[PDB]
Design a protein around this ligand. Structure first.
Ligand SMILES: O=C(O)COc1c(C(=O)O)sc2ncccc12
Length: 297
């Protein structure tokens, strides 16, 4: 049981050891396509690649490669697409993927610049009147509105397939205060943000999978998805004790390498799930508490 295990790990101070155990047991599958010479410039990090078996394929004959993985959680019945922060030459591919996979929501957990470096291209328009056209993939993207909070921004975007003139509303959930290789400020601010994504309907099975990305698409992204899946599993069964967080993470790691990047991100995942469970088991008022504690205004 997660809460007992949590206290047991804290007491012995063995988070590093627990985390390394997961790293040792984690799946290892080929990433041949990712490592092809022609794809070198499509990858942000040399050591972060999608497995061939779970990679998202672009619907194009030229080159179908993007650094993105489908995390298909069978038992939970929810899917996520985890991807790197798009590069200056892959923003058209990124939006092509969003279109083709029928995603309603995009979750961004990093800033464009972190620690003096550019961890992600400016892939969405910052101003209504300055829309973006991705010539390579024939897509248009317009900022419709934004709602800026203290530590996260929600944007409404219109994505248009210029080939067919069909348009879709994409919701962009941008968490601005989560450091690379770090953790959110509190379980509350993380949970407040996750529930915003949930409340939008972006995670509905009636949609294609939500797109989740930080810089590499494994650390912060893995943490977000792990917490969400654990809460959903618990919710389906209405049974917090049925959820084995480490087992869930190992299942996720069958679909993308390196999910959760530090022992403290793992420890934070426990905190978030333990706290989120209060809502699941029907203390609705806790949502209000998170909103307040998060200081979003
Ligand atoms: O998302 C995270 O916490 C860590 O993600 C990564 C990086 C970053 O955000 O600068 S750089 C990097 N290199 C290899 C694997 C993950 C990451």
């Amino acid at each position: 049981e997660m809460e007992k295990e949590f206290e047991q790990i804290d007491k012995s101070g063995s988070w590093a050891a627990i985390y390394q155990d997961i790293r040792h047991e984690a799946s290892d599958f080929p990433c041949r396509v990712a490592k092809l010479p022609k794809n070198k410039n499509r990858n942000r990090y040399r050591d972060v690649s999608p497995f061939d078996h779970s990679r998202i394929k672009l619907h194009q004959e030229d080159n179908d490669y993007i650094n993105a993985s489908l995390i298909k959680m069978e038992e939970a019945q929810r899917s996520y697409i985890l991807t790197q922060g798009p590069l200056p030459n892959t923003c058209g591919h990124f939006w092509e993927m969003v279109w083709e996979q029928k995603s309603r929501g995009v979750v961004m957990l990093n800033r464009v610049m972190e620690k003096g470096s550019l961890k992600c291209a400016q892939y969405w328009p910052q101003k209504e009147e300055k829309e973006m056209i991705f010539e390579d993939t024939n897509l248009k993207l317009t900022l419709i509105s934004e709602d800026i909070k203290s530590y996260y921004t929600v944007r409404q975007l219109e994505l248009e397939n210029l080939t067919t003139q069909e348009t879709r509303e994409i919701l962009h959930f941008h968490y601005t205060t989560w450091p690379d290789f770090g953790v959110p400020e509190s379980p509350a601010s993380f949970l407040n943000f996750l529930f915003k994504v949930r409340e939008s309907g972006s995670l509905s099975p009636e949609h294609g999978p939500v797109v989740v990305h930080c810089s590499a698409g494994i650390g912060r992204s893995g943490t977000f998805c792990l917490a969400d899946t654990c809460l959903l599993l618990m919710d389906k069964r209405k049974d917090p004790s049925s959820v084995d967080i480490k087992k869930v993470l190992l299942e996720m790691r069958k679909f993308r390498m390196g999910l959760i990047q530090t022992a403290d991100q793992l420890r934070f995942s426990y905190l978030a799930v333990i706290e989120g469970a209060k809502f699941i088991m029907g203390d609705s008022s806790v949502q209000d508490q998170w909103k307040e504690l998060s200081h979003e205004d």
